[PDB]
From a paper:
The plant membrane receptor kinase [name] is a central regulator of plant immunity. It is required for signal transduction of conserved microbe-associated molecular patterns sensed by receptor-like proteins which lack cytoplasmic signalling domains. [name] and RLPs are likely to form heteromeric signalling complexes. The conserved GxxxG motifs in their transmembrane regions, but neither the [name] [name] ectodomain nor the kinase domain, are required for this interaction to occur in planta.
Here, we present the crystal structure of the [name] ectodomain from [name] (AtSOBIR1) and discuss its implications for plant immune signalling. The model was refined against an isomorphous, high-resolution native data set at 1.55 Å resolution. However, both an active kinase domain and the [name] [name] ectodomain are required for signalling. The crystal structure of the [name] ectodomain reveals five LRRs sandwiched between unusual N-terminal and C-terminal capping domains. SERK1 shares the number of LRRs and the N-terminal capping domain with [name], but has a canonical, disulfide-bond-stabilized C-terminal cap. Analysis of the crystal packing with the PISA server revealed a rather small complex interface of ∼1000 Å2 formed by several salt bridges, hydrogen bonds and a few hydrophobic contacts. We next performed analytical size-exclusion chromatography and right-angle light-scattering experiments to assess the oligomeric state of the [name] extracellular domain in solution.
Numbering used by the authors: 34 to 56, 64 to 224
Write the structure that this text describes.
Amino acid sequence: WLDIDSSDLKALQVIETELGVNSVNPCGRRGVFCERRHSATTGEYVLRVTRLVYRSRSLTGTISPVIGMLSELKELTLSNNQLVNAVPVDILSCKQLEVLDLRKNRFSGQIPGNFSSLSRLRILDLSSNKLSGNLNFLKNLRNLENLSVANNLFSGKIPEQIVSFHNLRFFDFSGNRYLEGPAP
Ligand SMILES: *[C@@H]1O[C@H](CO)[C@@H](O[C@@H]2O[C@H](CO)[C@@H](O)[C@H](O)[C@H]2NC(C)=O)[C@H](O)[C@H]1NC(C)=O
Ligand SMILES: [Cl-]
């Protein structure tokens, strides 16, 4: 029996509180998934938080900047809540992120261009929010398999690079009135 990493545990508390997830080793239950890893110190095996999955829980909070302290995070799934305000730039510290699913919330603001640094992203579902600005951050997300930005306020055009993505099997940017497709 392993224990959860002390730092991940402390970060999880603040993240859940700010999301609105209401009430020691939370791994493997209630939306928290962990994986066995070598600890920074010691080298002994410890559990790290790798997935936060909180669909359909009537959450009304926000994504705390402390999300960036979960260095091993692979999945943040927050679909079908009432979460508000901006996607924090601190999520760029989650370099291993593969799944970012924020569909059907009320997230607002813009996505900064350096979101393209999340090179491992495979599933990016921002659909049905109130996000705005351009989609230049998609330029270098070459591993995307599932991409939806539908039903937002995005404008400009899809980056031409999307034409070269080889794994893209689901793509939706409908419901963005001032948004045009990728064109040369
Ligand atoms: C990614 O780019 C964004 C936008 O330029 C950066 O956001 C700024 O972050 C600093 C803290 O590092 C804040 O004080 C600023 O207010 C933010 N600006 C905006 C417009 O939100 C972000 O820091 C960049 N991150 C990385 C890793 O490059
Ligand atoms: Cl879920």
